[PDB]
Ligand binder design. Structure first.
Ligand SMILES: [Mg+2]
Ligand SMILES: [Mg+2]
Ligand SMILES: [Mg+2]
Ligand SMILES: [Mg+2]
Ligand SMILES: [Mg+2]
Ligand SMILES: [Mg+2]
Ligand SMILES: [Mg+2]
Ligand SMILES: [Mg+2]
Ligand SMILES: [Mg+2]
Ligand SMILES: [Mg+2]
Ligand SMILES: [Mg+2]
Ligand SMILES: [Mg+2]
Ligand SMILES: [Mg+2]
Ligand SMILES: [Mg+2]
Ligand SMILES: [Mg+2]
Ligand SMILES: [Mg+2]
Ligand SMILES: [Mg+2]
Ligand SMILES: [Mg+2]
Ligand SMILES: [Mg+2]
Ligand SMILES: [Mg+2]
Lengths: 208, 100, 151, 82, 126, 115, 99
RNA sequence: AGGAGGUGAGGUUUU
RNA sequence: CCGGCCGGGAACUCAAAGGAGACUGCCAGUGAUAAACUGGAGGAAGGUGGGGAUGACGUCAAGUCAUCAUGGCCCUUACGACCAGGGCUACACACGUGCUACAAUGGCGCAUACAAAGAGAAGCGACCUCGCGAGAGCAAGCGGACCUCAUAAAGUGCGUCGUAGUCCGGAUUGGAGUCUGCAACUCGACUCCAUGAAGUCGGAAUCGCUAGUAAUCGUGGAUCAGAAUGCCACGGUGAAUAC
């Protein structure tokens, strides 16, 4: 615990924010609480569908949610059977009219959240941590990424003593801010305890 | 924090919002310079009979996620740990660590 | 310190006489950044010393500084487990700094009612070759001459 | 201390109990928990056992104790030296 | 023809306007003696004019804001030097020799976390 | 130079001199001087006797050493006899206004005393 | 005689918004005083980073609320309708007043 | 670069 | 109408947006024709121009099961739930971190200049009246380069004290009061009238600091109905020394 969050340190330069709405002191707390509620609802409902990111905006006292996911067909439904329900519940929670947008995440193996969730699912399904890490690293390195690092910590293999294992392939410069670093974490709850997974992906430096 | 603590906080908020006007009237009567010396006494007599939870001074500001009383920030409505956790991921707009 | 060579910094001269030794003296005498009070005290003391001794303020300060100035100082060598205090010649800048520091300490230890009066009396005594400042100088010289056997 | 214009503070649950006893003459030791209330002249002559935290300490109110807070006459923490 | 100069310091800013005249000085609708009580400030402001003999030939009007007495004096001196450089441009080689052309850059260092001051670390004991 | 039964120094100014009495400070000295029409740059000496007489008359309006201490002692004894918390703290020799007794209570505890 | 204040968190998004507003004004009118930058609100927070005993380790965050002002001297009815008509992206709030 | 002359807490334990 | 106030201006500070610039780029010398080192030419900055964030595989089975999540154990008419009072502020003591000081480079009285950075809608609270004073009343303005907080202080000039436990020191204590808060006793803050302790530069030993740094002087903010000498930032004066 001596490392800083790359996504939090690259907010100003490269990485965008997950919430681009404006308010004042009187509304900031309420907006953050509503965003937390809707994010908790979405991450609990769309668990099967590979969901990557949720951006929230509040223009003209209305809420615009944009879900970047890898399974738009099952996220939406047959002809709007689930997206309409999601819009209705989001509008009911926020007290304002809602507009939901869907974005497709091409190359799902290059997204930190999806890979971390897959690793967590495999760990809770009793798949080998080393095998999962090697498969994920190889897939992410062959689909066109310039570097990947995967770390797994805590009660590996049902042992009585925790440990921290990790794999690296390529280059993952964390001290370079202009570098396009995608980082995320995940937690698996197995009968032997809790296991933490962290993923860093490098997508090339940015100029501008 | 604790479900009991959160229930106490929400009950106190509801009572304060219910009895805000009645207590304000009594406070105005007490603070009024030109008022009956017996009416001003009956004002405090009636005021001290109201439930103590109906006072804004008895409700503590906690985190809307956990309920931690210490480290609370009013603008964000969360504790210091949760504010940092949200900022590092980007849920809070324009909250970037800087230097000068 | 250990590696770098320290270049000196520009020191602003005083306006009353256009010198730099007076500016260094008022900087040494200054505490908590009270440069205005230090300058006023120094100017009053210099005026009193000049009207006492007939000389000018700058000449009186120079002769007092020359009288207080030492030439050698005892320092530890520590070849092995030995506390050998070996004498060595002192640069003029450090001589002036030590003289000013000793004058300030003597003025502070003086029992008069005003710091300006204490400083003026100490400067007069230094010019007349007396006082605790010249006693400290004599003690340093005696220690150096006792340790003269060490090169 | 308390603002002079507001006046002394006293709880109704003790005010009623003392104003009844004033005419009732039931000088048996009353019991109370409100040690934050002032002492009125009508209380003089009665015995009140006030809650110090564990039990009720009895106090006989006198003339010299009017403006003093009631809780001042009941020790809270036991101490006898080392 | 009115020449202009600007000077800065830690937190001060001074605009100086120079005109050919008889050396009178106006600062914030006042005078140098009434404004700067200490004469070290007067020495600082007149130092360029003492270095190059143009005291009794330039009437100047100065507006200053921010900082303290020394900061305002330094900003005024810098503005006067810039105005003189605009006036003649042949005095730059001499002013830079004494250090008047070069611009002050020392600023109040910010306070940090865990230290009672900019560099004053708290006391240590085992 | 004798006021209220005590002696008063002569080389000091009137305001400082009046503060030597138990119950008179700078405010109660300046008020007396203003009421009696006496400046503050003058000393006890260099003054007539009518000024001192009217100064004593104006001082008599207040409470001074003879009655000042009696009132304080009576209040302390009343508190101790009543048995209030403040009176008990005075009996024990501890701060009465509300402070810390774990550390930094030397003024009431007296000098340091080990086991 | 009509003043609009725009507050945002991005100096580029607010610049785009005020440029669009200036273009709309130049289309449906003229005599625009131009975008004038107003002082930025630097709101700073200092929080702890450990859930336990660590005082010297803290994180300092800041929020830079950028502010712009636009004044229009010929507020025609069509210009006012278009200004109320057009909407801006999130993260920018616009207050419109007459004065 | 080769040959010659010296040259270190005087002591200070256990875990 | 003496106040940028009112016509007026895009010149200036300044408010922010985009750019230039500082990169060993040149000159001379040394260096193994190199890297590299010393000086100076220009230049606002010369060698990382200053400061800050950013803290490599890893140790300390280091800390947090009481931010939170969670494997396992534990009670489920109580290790759960509600309320009143008290306690977390005790006290023969020992320790750390800081504040006030021990005094003339000063205390006190009058007069008078120069700032920066921030907060404000259950809020900031002008002007005026009253109270010596904390503050009370009517009541504008401001969601804020506009209005309030908010007078900056140290500083300077003119006087007094004249080396004393002092016109230093304000501890402690008594009385009378103000504000917030249903409710200031055990325990809030502040004002006035008095009281005016110990202390006169501090033992072994030890701490921080190499420049706008140390030292010193004020200001603001988070927390908060009210409650910091603490914490986080801001500027004013401003060093000595480094063989
Ligand atoms: Mg870190
Ligand atoms: Mg780096
Ligand atoms: Mg829980
Ligand atoms: Mg509270
Ligand atoms: Mg600390
Ligand atoms: Mg420590
Ligand atoms: Mg206390
Ligand atoms: Mg043994
Ligand atoms: Mg050079
Ligand atoms: Mg352990
Ligand atoms: Mg525990
Ligand atoms: Mg405690
Ligand atoms: Mg004086
Ligand atoms: Mg008045
Ligand atoms: Mg003064
Ligand atoms: Mg005093
Ligand atoms: Mg007093
Ligand atoms: Mg260093
Ligand atoms: Mg508060
Ligand atoms: Mg400072």
């Amino acid at each position: 615990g001596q490392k800083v969050h790359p996504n939090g340190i690259r907010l100003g330069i490269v990485k965008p924010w997950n919430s681009t709405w404006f308010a004042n002191t009187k509304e900031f707390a309420d907006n953050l609480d509503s965003d937390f509620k809707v994010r908790q609802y979405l991450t609990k409902e769309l668990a099967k569908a590979s969901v990557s990111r949720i951006v929230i905006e509040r223009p003209a006292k209305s809420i615009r949610v944009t879900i970047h996911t890898a399974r738009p067909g099952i996220v939406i439904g047959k002809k709007g059977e689930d997206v309409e329900k999601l819009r209705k519940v989001v509008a009911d929670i926020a007290g304002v009219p809602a507009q939901i947008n869907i974005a497709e995440v091409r190359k799902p193996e290059l997204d930190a959240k999806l890979v971390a969730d897959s690793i967590t699912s495999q760990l809770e399904r009793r798949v080998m941590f080393r095998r999962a890490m090697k498969r994920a690293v190889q897939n992410a390195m062959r689909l066109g990424a310039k570097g990947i690092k995967v770390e797994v910590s805590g009660r590996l293999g049902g042992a009585e003593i925790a440990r921290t294992e990790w794999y690296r392939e390529g280059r993952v410069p964390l001290h370079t801010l202009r570098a396009d670093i995608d980082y995320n974490t995940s937690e698996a709850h197995t009968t032997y305890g809790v296991i933490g997974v962290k993923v860093w992906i490098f997508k090339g430096e940015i100029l501008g | 924090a604790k479900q009991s603590m959160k229930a106490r906080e929400v009950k106190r908020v509801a009572l304060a919002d219910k009895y805000f006007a009645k207590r304000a009237e009594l406070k105005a009567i007490i603070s009024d310079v030109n008022a009956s010396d017996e009416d001003r006494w009956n004002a405090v007599l009636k005021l001290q009979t109201l439930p103590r939870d109906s006072s804004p001074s008895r409700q503590r500001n906690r985190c809307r996620q956990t309920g931690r009383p210490h480290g609370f920030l009013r603008k964000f409505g969360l504790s210091r740990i949760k504010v940092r956790e949200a900022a590092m991921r980007g849920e809070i707009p324009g909250l970037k660590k800087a230097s000068w | 310190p250990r590696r770098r060579v320290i270049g000196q910094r520009k020191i602003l001269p005083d306006p009353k006489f256009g010198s730099e030794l007076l500016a260094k003296f008022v900087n040494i005498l200054m505490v908590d950044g009270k440069k205005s009070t230090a300058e006023s005290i120094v100017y009053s003391a210099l005026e009193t010393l000049a009207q006492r001794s007939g000389k000018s303020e700058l000449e009186a300060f120079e002769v007092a500084l020359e009288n207080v100035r030492p030439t050698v100082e005892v320092k530890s060598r520590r070849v092995g487990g030995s506390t050998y205090q070996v004498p060595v010649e002192v640069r003029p800048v450090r001589r002036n700094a030590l003289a000013m520091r000793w004058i300030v300490e003597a003025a502070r230890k003086r029992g008069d009612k005003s710091m300006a009066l204490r400083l003026a009396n100490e400067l007069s005594d230094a010019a007349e070759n007396k006082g605790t400042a010249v006693k400290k100088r004599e003690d340093v010289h005696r220690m150096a001459e006792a340790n003269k056997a060490f090169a | 201390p308390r603002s002079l214009k507001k006046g002394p503070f006293i709880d109704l649950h003790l005010l009623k109990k003392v104003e009844k006893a004033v005419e009732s003459g039931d000088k048996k030791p009353l019991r109370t928990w409100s040690r934050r209330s002032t002492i009125f002249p009508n209380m003089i002559g009665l015995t009140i056992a006030v809650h110090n935290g564990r039990q009720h300490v009895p106090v006989f109110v006198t003339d010299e104790m009017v403006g003093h807070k009631l809780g001042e006459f009941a020790p809270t923490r036991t101490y006898r030296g080392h | 023809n009115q020449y202009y100069g600007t000077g800065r310091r830690k937190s001060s800013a001074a605009r100086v306007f120079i005109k050919p005249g008889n050396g009178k000085i106006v600062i914030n609708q006042r005078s140098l003696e009434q404004y700067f009580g200490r004469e070290t400030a007067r020495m600082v402001v007149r130092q360029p004019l003492e270095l190059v003999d143009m005291v009794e030939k330039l009437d100047l009007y100065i507006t200053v804001k921010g900082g303290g007495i020394s900061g305002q004096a330094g900003a005024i001196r810098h503005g006067i030097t810039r105005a003189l450089m605009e006036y003649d441009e042949s005095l730059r080689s001499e002013l830079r020799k004494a250090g008047f052309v070069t611009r002050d850059a020392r600023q109040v260092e910010r306070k940090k976390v865990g230290l009672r001051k900019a560099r004053r670390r708290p006391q240590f004991s085992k | 130079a004798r006021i209220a039964g005590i002696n008063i120094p002569d080389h000091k100014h009137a305001v400082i001199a009046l503060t030597s009495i138990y119950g008179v400070g700078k405010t109660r000295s300046k008020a007396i001087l203003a009421a009696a029409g006496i400046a503050e740059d003058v000393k006890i000496s260099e003054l007539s006797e009518g000024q001192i007489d009217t100064l004593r008359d104006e001082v008599a309006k207040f409470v001074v050493e003879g009655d000042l201490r009696r009132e304080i002692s009576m209040s302390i004894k009343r508190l101790m006899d009543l048995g209030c918390y403040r009176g008990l703290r005075h009996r024990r020799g501890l701060p009465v206004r509300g402070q810390r007794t774990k550390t930094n209570a030397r003024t009431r505890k007296g000098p340091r005393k080990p086991i | 005689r009509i003043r609009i204040r725009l507050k945002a968190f991005d100096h580029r998004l607010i610049d785009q918004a005020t440029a669009e507003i200036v273009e709309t004004a130049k289309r449906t009118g003229a005599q625009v005083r131009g975008p004038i930058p107003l002082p930025t609100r630097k709101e700073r927070f200092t929080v702890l980073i450990s859930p336990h005993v660590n005082k010297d380790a803290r994180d300092q965050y800041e929020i830079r609320t950028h502010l712009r002002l636009v004044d229009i001297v010929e507020p025609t009815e069509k210009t006012v309708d278009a200004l109320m008509r057009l909407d801006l992206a999130a993260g920018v709030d616009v207050q419109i007043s007459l004065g």
